[PDB]
Design a protein around this ligand. Structure first.
Ligand SMILES: *[C@H]1O[C@H](CO)[C@@H](O)[C@H](O)[C@H]1F
Ligand code: NA
Length: 442
């Protein structure tokens, strides 16, 4: 494959508001489901919360300094709905909009294109009190929030994503209970998935009407390429079920193909009520799709397990990070599939990276060679994808800096920059210097 990326390729790093900002009560911010969840004893592995995190509400200028030192040309970050509409449904908080306005101006002044995520999991708690993503009304008010934000910032921000990883919000938040709000019911999770998709579609339409200029609007999906452990009917069916559970359940309705019928049959009475009107809304045309990629699923049939009755067959020969199996070829596979089998284009890699047991060494650096190798290998797969015609326009490393990693708290470090959570000092890791020098060469 090729050596060089396009001259106008987007090179960035990514964060999310609750994971980095802190300042959870400042300047009118409301309570989010992640404030409630992280303050519930036992939900976070290490007793931490997002109360301070990286203090990026006050220290985003330091984050900009890091992006500049890395030679990036873009920054993917989220806007906290609790800062914009603290009650979820209700009046706006101009102080919240002004904060992000200043941030956007600081990014543009630095030559960093803002790639804004509207929803990165921090649902206002008052909406969860009224069933959260279990209620259609949450979709409606999400679109109202999207309208307000674009009205004020859309003169400067062209590239917007509605949702980050609706599979996580629905299935981890309402079915498996490991993410906020922490419910454990399949029917509620599937209902949440529909109202997330509906909220996405309503927001796209609202954003286009509210925008002062044409916008490039996408959605961001985690995708897991799935492979049967054997060619038996049982294992192949398990792979199809897992592929439907994570990938096709979201890709198909967004593509105007309805929900996948095999999954509707498998889910039975737990499937949501989806009329043709909702599906037309959900398929609101998009300008790009964001792909979040870390891992494959090598599936074996698991009849006694919870739905989708498919377990991972571990490969001890493959490298593992602090929390995941490394399989770079899956990134090529999933992109080839999107390019040839689905209508979304162009594509951005909106999240890719890894977690390691990073420490500051005696010399002062962070020697994260496995993370450097992770980036090198995945970037090579992107060159293969580009060679095959995949319309890939950018890449965002997850994450700019170590941050609050959801149910694992501050204990799971994904940064290309190290965060000292006691002093708030950031330091570039060796992999970040590698990205800097690779990008500079491009
Ligand atoms: C994508 O995955 C990373 C690692 O688990 C999370 O920190 C991000 O919030 C999620 F969008
Ligand atoms: Na390892």
């Amino acid at each position: 494959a090729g050596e060089r990326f396009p001259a106008d390729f987007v090179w960035g790093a990514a964060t999310a508001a609750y994971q980095i900002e802190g300042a959870v009560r400042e300047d009118g911010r409301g309570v989010s489901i992640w404030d409630t969840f992280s303050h519930t004893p036992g939900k976070i592995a290490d007793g931490t919360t997002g109360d301070v995190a990286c203090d990026s509400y006050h220290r985003y200028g330091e984050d900009i300094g890091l992006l500049n030192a890395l030679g990036m040309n873009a920054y993917r970050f989220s806007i906290a709905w609790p800062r914009i509409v603290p009650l979820g449904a209700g009046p706006i908080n101009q102080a919240g909009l002004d904060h992000y306005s200043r941030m956007v101006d600081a990014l543009l002044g630095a030559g960093l294109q803002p790639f804004v995520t509207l929803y990165h999991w921090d649902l206002p708690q008052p909406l969860e009190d009224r069933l959260g993503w279990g209620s259609r009304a949450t979709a409606t008010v999400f679109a109202e929030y999207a309208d307000i934000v674009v009205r004020q910032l859309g003169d400067r921000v062209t590239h917007w994503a509605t949702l980050n990883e609706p599979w996580c919000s629905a299935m981890l938040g309402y079915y498996l209970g490991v993410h906020a709000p922490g419910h454990t019911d399949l029917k509620r999770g599937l209902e949440a998935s529909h109202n997330l998709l509906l909220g996405h579609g309503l927001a796209v339409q609202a954003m286009r009407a509210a925008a002062p200029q044409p916008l490039q609007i996408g959605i961001v999906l985690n995708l897991t390429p799935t492979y049967p452990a054997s060619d038996s009917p049982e294992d192949v069916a398990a792979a199809r079920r897992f592929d439907g559970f994570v990938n096709r359940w979201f890709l198909d309705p967004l593509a105007g193909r309805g929900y996948p019928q095999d999954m509707l049959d498998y889910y039975g009475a737990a499937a949501p009520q989806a009329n043709p009107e909702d599906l037309t809304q959900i398929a609101a045309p998009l300008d790009w799709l964001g792909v979040n990629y870390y891992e494959r699923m090598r599936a074996v049939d698991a009849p006694d397990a919870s739905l989708p009755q498919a377990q991972r067959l571990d490969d001890p020969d493959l490298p593992h990070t602090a929390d995941r199996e490394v399989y770079p070829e899956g990134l090529y596979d999933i992109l080839l599939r999107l390019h040839n089998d689905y209508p979304f284009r162009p594509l951005y890699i909106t999240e890719n990276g890894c977690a390691l047991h990073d420490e500051i060494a005696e010399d002062g650096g962070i020697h994260d060679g496995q993370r450097q190798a992770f980036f090198e290998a995945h970037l090579a797969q992107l060159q293969r994808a580009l060679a095959a015609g995949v319309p890939l326009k950018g890449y965002f490393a997850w994450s700019l800096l170590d941050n609050f990693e959801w149910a694992m708290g501050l204990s799971m470090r994904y940064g290309i920059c190290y965060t000292n959570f006691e002093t708030l000092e950031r330091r570039i890791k060796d992999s970040g210097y590698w990205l800097r020098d690779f990008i500079a060469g491009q």
